[PDB]
Every structure is written in structure tokens, then in C-alpha cells.
């Protein structure tokens, strides 16, 4: 499988999430995703084929995971924007007010702005703190996906939000949306991963 930010992957043939970013760890290949998508050792599949398993994750508290891949996978510095691609050029963190986009398997590529930082989400399994809030919409299936600026700076992975009954928050105004991602900086240092860039 070619690994690109935003594409779909299943976990133990059940749940679906989206890939955040291609990273390496020494000679090992992986992608960072949301902690809540799997448990350590769960099997990740891309188009019915096994690509790896969860190497580590944290959820709740934080919401982060990295999946280590077989050697056969192809990592690319890119994030899916329909049929086109945004090149990952780094990880400079943007400030509040910067514009940002996110890619995931359920709503595709949505853009918006960062409204707040360090927010706590009171998820049912427990709180997750230190989340950055954006107003780009998203829906079930979007978790783990990429948050990136048009210029290429990877921002974090999709964690949660206020989904309405249609399963997304795309049907309500930007001002009423709360879309939270996990910052990428800490996930890279916590696990010693390097981002694949182009």
C-alpha cells in the first residue's frame, strides 16, 4: 500500500480510521494515528491487506498511536486532497487564527482555522487534555487523520468533535464547530519518530 495521510485503514477488521502521517523510527516504517483507533497489537489493514500493527498508543489522557509497518509499505510525504496531494514539508506549529486543513476518509479534505489551544475534551472513556481546536468539519471515520497547513506544516491528528446525528459537524456553521486534534510535536518526541518530508 502507498502510505498517504488521510486514507482509510481498518483495525482488527472492525473500526475504521484515517492515516495521519508517514514517519520512520530507525529502519522501521510507521504512520501516526489517533490513540483511540486501536490497542497495542491491533492489526491495521489497507484495502483488505495487513500493513502492520499498533506499536504503542495513549488514550484517554492524550489521543496518540503509531502503527509499525511491514517493509513492503511505501511511505510518502503526502496528504490526500481529493485526487491531488499536499506535500509534507515539516512540523512548524501554527498559532491561533492560522488557517488549516484536515484530510480523512469520511469527509475528505476540509479547511478552517485554529480557534483554540490546550482544550480538554471530556470523552466518555475519560478526558483528553491539551487538544488544539479547529473549525474545519469532520465525521466518524475521520479520526487519526492529518491536520496540515496548505504550506505543508503537519499540525496533528484528528481526535474528536461535536458530531450531530448525521455523523459529522459539516451541517452546522463553522462558528459552532469544535474539531479537536492532538498536536504532532509531542507524538514525534514521545516515540522518537521522524516525519517523512518532501
Amino acid at each position: 500500500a502507498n502510505i498517504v495521510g488521510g486514507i482509510e485503514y481498518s483495525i482488527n477488521n472492525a473500526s475504521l480510521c484515517s492515516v495521519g502521517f508517514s514517519v520512520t523510527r530507525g529502519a522501521t516504517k510507521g504512520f501516526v494515528t489517533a490513540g483511540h483507533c486501536g490497542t497495542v497489537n491491533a492489526t491495521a489493514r489497507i484495502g483488505g491487506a495487513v500493513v502492520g500493527t499498533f506499536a504503542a498508543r495513549v488514550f484517554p489522557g492524550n489521543d496518540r498511536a503509531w502503527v509499525s509497518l511491514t517493509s513492503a509499505q511505501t511511505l510518502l510525504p503526502r496528504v490526500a486532497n481529493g485526487s491531488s496531494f499536499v506535500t509534507v514539508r515539516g512540523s512548524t506549529e501554527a498559532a491561533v487564527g492560522a488557517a488549516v486543513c484536515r484530510s480523512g476518509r469520511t469527509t475528505g479534505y476540509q479547511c478552517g482555522t485554529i480557534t483554540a489551544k490546550n482544550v480538554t475534551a471530556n470523552y466518555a472513556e475519560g478526558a483528553v487534555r491539551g487538544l488544539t481546536q479547529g473549525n474545519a468539519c469532520m465525521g466518524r471515520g475521520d479520526s487519526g487523520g492529518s491536520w496540515i497547513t496548505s504550506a505543508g506544516q503537519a499540525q496533528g491528528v484528528m481526535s474528536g468533535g461535536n458530531v450531530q446525528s448525521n455523523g459529522n459537524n459539516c451541517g452546522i456553521p463553522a462558528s459552532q464547530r469544535s474539531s479537536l486534534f492532538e498536536r504532532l510535536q509531542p507524538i514525534l518526541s514521545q516515540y522518537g519518530l521522524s516525519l517523512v518530508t518532501g
Partner: peptide
Amino acid sequence: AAPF
């Protein structure tokens, strides 16, 4: 909010 809900996680996903």
C-alpha cells in the same frame, strides 16, 4: 465532543 466524542472521539472517533
